[PDB]
Design a binder for this molecule. Structure first.
Ligand SMILES: COc1ccc2c(c1)NCCO2
Ligand SMILES: [Mn+2]
Ligand SMILES: [Mn+2]
Lengths: 137, 137
C-alpha cells in the first residue's frame, strides 16, 4: 500500500541557480549537495534537484499542464507572490479557480504554483458547483 | 513561508486509463472524476489528473530525470513491485542509486518510483556511501 509522496525530483540544467531558487528565493531548507544534485525539504516535502544534461530550459507554451503546487497560508500569499515578482519570476497562468493560486516558473521552466486550500476545501466547493460531468465517490 | 506540497498535477492524454492506473493498479483513493480530470489521494498527497490535449505519451529515453516517488513500507515493497512487473508495467531504471526503489512508468510515461525510506534515512545512508562531492548541512 502506498502511503504518500516520498519525494519529488526535478531535473535541472544548472545546479547552482536551481539551488539558489529553491533555497534562497523560495526558502526551502538545503540538507545536502553533491556534484550532481541536492536534497532540500519544504515542510514534509523531500525535494531532490538532479543535474541532468537532458533537461531543456522549456518555455511554458511547450510543456504540458503537469505542475507542482506548494502550500502557503492566505496571510502569507500576497507577500510571497510579490517576492517572486520582484525577483522577475515568470508567471505561466492566471488564477481562475477557488483558493488563491500564483502560477510561476522555475529556472528550467518547471511549472510551479503557490496554492491556499486543501483537497477537502476543493471538494466542498465542487459539491456546490460541480464541474461538467462530475461524479463523487 | 512554504510548508509542503499542496498538490501534484499530472497532465494525462486519456483520462480513463490514467484513473484506472492510479486508482485500480496503484491503490490510490479516487474522490471525484469529471469530463476533464480526477482528484485522488495517496495518504496525505492530493493528486490531480488533468486531461490535456498537449500531453504526449513519452518514452523514458526522451524525457529528463524528473520523477515522482511514492512511499511504501519495507514489508510491502517487493510484492508491490513484483505485481507491477507481472502486470506488464513498463520501467525506466534498474540501478538502485538512491536506496530501495522500483522505477516504473505511468500510461503517458510519467516517471514514477516506489521508495522505502525517509529523507533522514537517505541522508544517514549517504554519510556511509556518499555521492561524489557530497556535503551535509
Ligand atoms: C465520471 O465517473 C465515472 C466513473 C466510472 C466510470 C465512468 C465514469 N465512465 C465509464 C466507466 O466507469
Ligand atoms: Mn494546481
Ligand atoms: Mn527518486
Amino acid at each position: 500500500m502506498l502511503s504518500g509522496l516520498n519525494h519529488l525530483t526535478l531535473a535541472v540544467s544548472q545546479l547552482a541557480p536551481s539551488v539558489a531558487f529553491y533555497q534562497q528565493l523560495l526558502g526551502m531548507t538545503l540538507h545536502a549537495r553533491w556534484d550532481s544534485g541536492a536534497y532540500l525539504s519544504c515542510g514534509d516535502l523531500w525535494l531532490c534537484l538532479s543535474l541532468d544534461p537532458q533537461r531543456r530550459v522549456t518555455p511554458p507554451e511547450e510543456s504540458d499542464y503537469t505542475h507542482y503546487a506548494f502550500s502557503i497560508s492566505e496571510a502569507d500569499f500576497a507577500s510571497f507572490a510579490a517576492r517572486l515578482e520582484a525577483a522577475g519570476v515568470a508567471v505561466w497562468k492566471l488564477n481562475r479557480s477557488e483558493g488563491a493560486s500564483h502560477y510561476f516558473l522555475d529556472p528550467d521552466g518547471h511549472k510551479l504554483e503557490l496554492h491556499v486550500g486543501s483537497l477537502a476545501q476543493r471538494l466542498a466547493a465542487c459539491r456546490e458547483q460541480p464541474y461538467k460531468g462530475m461524479v463523487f465517490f
